[PDB]
Ligand binder design. Structure first.
Ligand SMILES: C[C@@H]1CC[C@@]2(OC1)O[C@H]1C[C@H]3[C@@H]4CC=C5C[C@@H](OCC[C@H](CO)CO[C@@H]6O[C@H](CO)[C@@H](O[C@H]7O[C@H](CO)[C@@H](O)[C@H](O)[C@H]7O)[C@H](O)[C@H]6O)CC[C@]5(C)[C@H]4CC[C@]3(C)[C@H]1[C@@H]2C
Ligand SMILES: C[C@@H]1CC[C@@]2(OC1)O[C@H]1C[C@H]3[C@@H]4CC=C5C[C@@H](OCC[C@H](CO)CO[C@@H]6O[C@H](CO)[C@@H](O[C@H]7O[C@H](CO)[C@@H](O)[C@H](O)[C@H]7O)[C@H](O)[C@H]6O)CC[C@]5(C)[C@H]4CC[C@]3(C)[C@H]1[C@@H]2C
Ligand SMILES: C[C@@H]1CC[C@@]2(OC1)O[C@H]1C[C@H]3[C@@H]4CC=C5C[C@@H](O)CC[C@]5(C)[C@H]4CC[C@]3(C)[C@H]1[C@@H]2C
Ligand SMILES: C[C@@H]1CC[C@@]2(OC1)O[C@H]1C[C@H]3[C@@H]4CC=C5C[C@@H](O)CC[C@]5(C)[C@H]4CC[C@]3(C)[C@H]1[C@@H]2C
Ligand SMILES: *[C@@H]1O[C@H](CO)[C@@H](O)[C@H](O)[C@H]1NC(C)=O
Ligand SMILES: *[C@@H]1O[C@H](CO)[C@@H](O)[C@H](O)[C@H]1NC(C)=O
Ligand SMILES: [Ca+2]
Lengths: 562, 263, 90
């Protein structure tokens, strides 16, 4: 029944195939399909028939969205694939390549209708924007396309021209009255004078780039204030009161919590609360921030009490690290600083391999030398020190031969009694029974770790960098899209000011886009027809370049000469 | 020199002159353009600079985090701002080059020095402050993690960036060096024939001759100019004919001709 | 290369970047150098009448045609200038 196919589509897409067949609750069987090519493509796609599915895609009205949905379904089915041959064919589905090539043709044609194609609400896929489907399919290569990136740059710069110099923007930002000057160019389109100056001010300050740079500057200010409070003006428990700067910091973080709550429960529209929370927590930065907020809350709560005061200071200091590392996100916008963050992720896996090898060899060497050198030391903490802490520091050139080499041991006053050793009265006297063995083992360990292992890790990093470099740009393009969208949805004032925007939004909601816009019927129909024409031209170009391929010419010539 | 002529700025003048010696010495890099082995290296260093900027962003973020954390954990009662910045950025930066003074970070390795906890004594510099050892295992663990990240991951990642950038640049670096060598040759072609401080003589001679009274950019007689124009045009025609000929006997063109003719 | 910076539409900018007019100059001068190798130097250093008494090297500097300066003929002329009256094999 149609319920089964609806539930399969729910598993694969979970938001797009809503109302395809539950509408009428089944529709009457005689009535013809409203989007026959959509249904045939989807049906042909659910069963890994690619040639039939490609044919249906070639006749469908909205081809980019259909290709993107095919990409998503294919990558899901590949995970759910049993037989090796079907899985191999499913991995190489290249439906996203169809979308990229068709949109490349569309962008090359008009470059202004292509943007509307990207941001219009498709009728066949339940008012879903092509960018929304690309996000759903996680089609990173599609987001890397020059047309999508150009649209994103246009959104990012708002009413300002995309060619504006960064210096012009910064100088305008620090000195707001420069906005009314001709210093910075703007894209086209008594009381009126107030209205026009207010319109210009709002157009400049609502640009996502201005919001982003304001947030960056005041996040720097937040870090500076946090460091000042932590290091210089951190006072004893409330009996002697938190500092005024600390109270300001508390309010600042409260505004950050309000921003998080906004992003997690009031983002853009009314979807399922559980689904909305899942989408919010799916983002790793939204987990980093959450950890930072929780650590700050615990830190202040422990700080308010004398019995946990030092623990609260420690937790707050450790939370400063999380807040500072949260600053890495701003690096996504810059083209030189973007891909490096993604490359570091693969560097992490190579680091894990090197850490396994290091852990094995270091445990072996450290336990061996602790047994050889201090066999009578019962202190467990010192056992672990000498067994793992010191050999780990040997990697970074910290080789204290005064404790390992008999000739270089100081003439200190050391004891051999267990009672004196445990009580810490005197340092234990290291055993020098077979010290040549200790020195030889140290030499072998230094050789292995510092030369073989470190240079092998350098080789891994070098190889991984060469491999990743190409795909890292695409990943950065997708990350930059995510950053631009997030700062597009963000309110226009950086925290702690945010409080004002949130109050305004709540008051307006109680009292009363560039992306995902819906078009009039005539314009929508014209855009559909234009996309279909571009698709036909693209397919004709493919067929033509195939006919005049060398292999096809040879085959034709051979058959004809025979 | 202007600050050197006065007693109130004498040490400042000496400092500025010493810092200027560095600029003059680095000005010597220009002579390396002529040599073929030493030429492209200067251009490669320019891209190395951009990779260094990326690594410095990552280092700055991670180093600020670690340094502020350890200063908070280890010396929470030190009000001296200069020492705050020392312990927070100067020491962690030196950790990269193997300078790890565990005598100030590890409780077991702290000297039995005579240290104070009073704020007045700390500020006046009478005694070094006594580092806090409340949770020192945390300090050691953070130091271990920082050393791992910075010395292994970040440094080897910078080496990887340098390796990749060198491989990419190598081809274009020779062309850039050729252009730089052209610029150097032209400059030393226009230069007077005596090196400074002697130059003064050439300048005086040039000024005196200008008041009293090339291998490149030479203008030719009309006949020779016309002959050279005609020769260039003939060479252009031969080049275009060679292009067209190698196109006719290309495999693809032969196949297309054969297919049309057989049809 | 100037118009590529001043280019709006992506397709026109892409075509403008891949103009390969400097490649034409390199190939033509390679043919000229292979022909005579002594008239080619005069071609490099003569004052063109069509471009207001501008030397080909002057225009190459103007266009910042780095690939053209990398040509073996230009480098040989530069070596000849560099060594002056002395033989380049000294
Ligand atoms: C190319 C490759 C590099 C790596 C390697 O292979 C080749 O090199 C090899 C070289 C080799 C090493 C070569 C030599 C040796 C020496 C040998 O001891 C000989 C035995 C004698 C005696 O029994 C020990 O000595 C004496 O001990 C006493 C300790 O009670 C010291 O008293 C000190 O007591 C107090 C300490 O402060 C103070 O009062 C004074 O300071 C001083 O009074 C003496 O001063 C000292 O003389 C042990 C082995 C060792 C270290 C070799 C190890 C392996 C190598 C590194 C090879 C590599 C694979
Ligand atoms: C493969 C990988 C490498 C990296 C790592 O993971 C694995 O290794 C792990 C190993 C671990 C470490 C293992 C062990 C420890 C010890 C532990 O302390 C136990 C608590 C006890 C007690 O409360 C502290 O001790 C005592 O403190 C006293 C300070 O008042 C000292 O008094 C000194 O006072 C003065 C100082 O001059 C002088 O009078 C004398 O000098 C001396 O009297 C004692 O001498 C000393 O005994 C703290 C944590 C630490 C350092 C671990 C940290 C993390 C690791 C490095 C792991 C890595 C991830
Ligand atoms: C990288 C791993 C992490 C986990 C671990 O091994 C390395 O860390 C080590 C640190 C050790 C601590 C260090 C200091 C002390 C103080 C001493 O009075 C009692 C024993 C105790 C708690 C030790 C118990 C065993 C511990 C957690 C070890 C543990 C397997
Ligand atoms: C790489 C950056 C450069 C800029 C900067 O941070 C690192 O340098 C740091 C050096 C600091 C100095 C160091 C020493 C002293 C002496 C002390 O009596 C008063 C404070 C003062 C001037 C400090 C003010 C803040 C300064 C400039 C910091 C500044 C953000
Ligand atoms: C070492 O300790 C003993 C304990 O009695 C003491 O007599 C001797 O003077 C000490 N020697 C040193 C090295 O100071
Ligand atoms: C440390 O300083 C005090 C100050 O009175 C002094 O009495 C004591 O002898 C000093 N100890 C050392 C380590 O010299
Ligand atoms: Ca967030």
């Amino acid at each position: 029944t149609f319920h089964e196919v609806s539930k399969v589509l729910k598993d694969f897409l979970d938001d797009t195939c809503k109302g395809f067949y539950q509408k009428l609750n089944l529709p009457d069987m005689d009535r013809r399909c409203e989007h026959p090519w959509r249904d045939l493509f989807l049906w042909a796609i659910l069963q890994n028939r690619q040639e039939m599915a490609n044919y249906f895609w070639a006749m469908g009205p909205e081809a980019v969205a259909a290709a993107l949905v095919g990409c998503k379904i294919m990558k899901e089915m590949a995970h759910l694939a049993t037989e090796a041959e079907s899985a191999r064919s499913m991995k190489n589905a290249k439906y996203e390549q169809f979308a990229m090539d068709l949109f490349s043709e569309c962008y090359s044609n008009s470059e202004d209708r292509a943007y509307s194609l990207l941001v219009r609400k498709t009728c066949c896929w339940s008012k879903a924007t092509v960018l929304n489907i690309a996000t759903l399919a996680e089609a990173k290569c599609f987001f890397a396309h020059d047309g999508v990136q150009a649209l994103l740059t246009k959104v990012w710069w708002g009413a300002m021209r995309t060619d504006t110099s960064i210096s012009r923007l910064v100088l305008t930002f620090f000195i707001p009255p420069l906005v009314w000057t001709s210093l910075i160019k703007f894209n086209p389109e008594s009381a009126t004078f107030i209205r026009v100056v207010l319109r210009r001010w709002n157009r400049f300050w609502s640009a996502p780039v201005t919001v982003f740079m304001g947030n960056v500057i005041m996040y720097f200010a937040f870090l500076i204030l946090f460091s000042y409070v932590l290091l210089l003006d951190f006072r004893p428990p409330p009996p002697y009161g938190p500092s005024a700067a600390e109270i300001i910091l508390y309010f600042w973080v409260f505004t950050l919590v309000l921003e998080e709550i906004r992003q997690s429960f009031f983002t853009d529209e009314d979807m399922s609360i559980l689904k909305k929370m899942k989408l919010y927590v799916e983002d790793n930065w939204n987990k980093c921030d959450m950890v930072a907020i929780s650590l700050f809350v615990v830190g202040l709560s422990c700080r308010m009490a004398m019995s946990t005061y030092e623990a609260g200071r420690t937790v707050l200091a450790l939370d400063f690290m999380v807040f500072t590392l949260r600053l890495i996100h701003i690096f996504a916008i810059h083209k030189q600083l973007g891909p490096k963050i993604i490359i570091v992720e693969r560097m992490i896996k190579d680091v894990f391999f090197f850490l396994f090898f290091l852990s094995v060899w270091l445990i072996a060497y450290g336990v061996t030398t602790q047994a050889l050198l201090h066999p009578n030391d019962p202190r467990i903490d010192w056992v672990f020190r000498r067994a793992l802490y010191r050999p780990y520091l040997h990697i970074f050139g910290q080789i204290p031969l005064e404790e390992i080499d008999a000739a270089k041991m100081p003439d200190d006053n050391c004891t051999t009694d267990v009672q004196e050793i445990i009580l810490g009265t005197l340092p234990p006297c290291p055993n020098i029974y077979a010290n040549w063995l200790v020195i030889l083992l140290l030499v072998i360990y230094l050789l292995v770790t510092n030369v073989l292992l470190l240079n092998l890790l350098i080789a891994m990093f070098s190889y991984t960098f060469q491999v990743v470099q190409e795909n890292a740009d695409i990943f950065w393009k997708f990350q930059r899209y995510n950053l631009i969208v997030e700062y597009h949805s963000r309110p226009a004032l950086a925290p702690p000011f945010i409080i004002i925007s949130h109050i305004t939004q709540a008051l307006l909601s109680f009292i009363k886009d560039l992306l995902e816009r819906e078009l009039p019927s005539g314009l929508d129909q014209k855009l559909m027809t234009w996309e279909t024409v571009q698709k036909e031209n693209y397919l004709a170009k493919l067929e033509h370049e195939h006919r005049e391929s060398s292999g096809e010419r040879l085959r034709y010539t051979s058959s004809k000469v025979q």
